[PDB]
């Protein structure tokens, strides 16, 4: 069972801006997704402070970066709080309508696309480098779901009968053909060191 949804107009506009604007500094997508993962990790840590059973679905709080040159994917995995079905549908747990408005106003006043994360919509920077994004997620007390979109105004949601995750989120970037530098170990290492060097969770770059 696959459900197809339309993006809200403002989010479709955000995505079209990201996909169509000439902007060479694409590498910031990784900083933004790592930051989102850190935020998700913070959320489950906070819940666990008063209810340790929240970590029964996995105690380790970390981020994995997994390139796969055969599939042309870069996957960012975290063991954060995850998302419910309703969160997925609600713009991946964001306030993307108001955030998009604030980002657009900032762009008009001299900001650039690299500032996207200040507006709570950094996830969508994935579309700087990905033709399709698949998000697999598992929140405590909800089932595992897969969200997917190739932009074009719609996304899908289905229950994921794939490999179980204990808890967290996997963002699978199906890279554009000219963006395969982001599968190279030395390039990923460089970007992590430049933009994510103080993130307070382990970031493991897998090799192939």
Curated annotation (Swiss-Prot):
This is Heat shock protein HSP 90-alpha. The TPR repeat-binding motif mediates interaction with TPR repeat-containing proteins like the co-chaperone STUB1. ISGylated. The modification N6-acetyllysine is found at residues 43, 69. Molecular chaperone that promotes the maturation, structural maintenance and proper regulation of specific target proteins involved for instance in cell cycle control and signal transduction. Undergoes a functional cycle that is linked to its ATPase activity which is essential for its chaperone activity. This cycle probably induces conformational changes in the client proteins, thereby causing their activation. Interacts dynamically with various co-chaperones that modulate its substrate recognition, ATPase cycle and chaperone function. (Microbial infection) Seems to interfere with N.meningitidis NadA-mediated invasion of human cells. Decreasing HSP90 levels increases adhesion and entry of E.coli expressing NadA into human Chang cells; increasing its levels leads to decreased adhesion and invasion. Belongs to the heat shock protein 90 family. It is found in: Nucleus; Cytoplasm; Melanosome; Cell membrane. The chain holds residues 16 to 223 of 732 of the full protein. ATP binds at residues 36, 78, 97, 123. The gene is HSP90AA1. Residues 1-208 are annotated as: Interaction with NR3C1.
């Amino acid at each position: 069972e696959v459900e197809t949804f339309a993006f809200q107009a403002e989010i479709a506009q955000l995505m079209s801006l990201i996909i169509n604007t000439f902007y060479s500094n694409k590498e910031i997508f990784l900083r933004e997704l790592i930051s989102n993962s850190s935020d998700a990790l913070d959320k489950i840590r906070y819940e666990s402070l008063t209810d340790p059973s929240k970590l029964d679905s996995g105690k380790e709080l970390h981020i994995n970066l997994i390139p796969n040159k055969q599939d042309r994917t870069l996957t960012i995995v975290d063991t954060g709080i995850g998302m419910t079905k309703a969160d997925l549908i609600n713009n991946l747990g964001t306030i993307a309508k108001s955030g998009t408005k604030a980002f657009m106003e900032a762009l008009q006043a001299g900001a650039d696309i690299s500032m996207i994360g200040q507006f709570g919509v950094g996830f969508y920077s994935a579309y700087l480098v990905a033709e399709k994004v698949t998000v697999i997620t598992k929140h405590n007390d909800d089932e595992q779901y897969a969200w997917e979109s190739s932009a074009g105004g719609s996304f899908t949601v289905r229950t994921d009968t794939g490999e179980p995750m204990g808890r967290g989120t996997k963002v699978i970037l199906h890279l554009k053909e000219d963006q395969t530098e982001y599968l190279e170990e030395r390039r990923i290492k460089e970007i992590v060191k430049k933009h994510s060097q103080f993130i307070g969770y382990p970031i493991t770059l897998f090799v192939e």
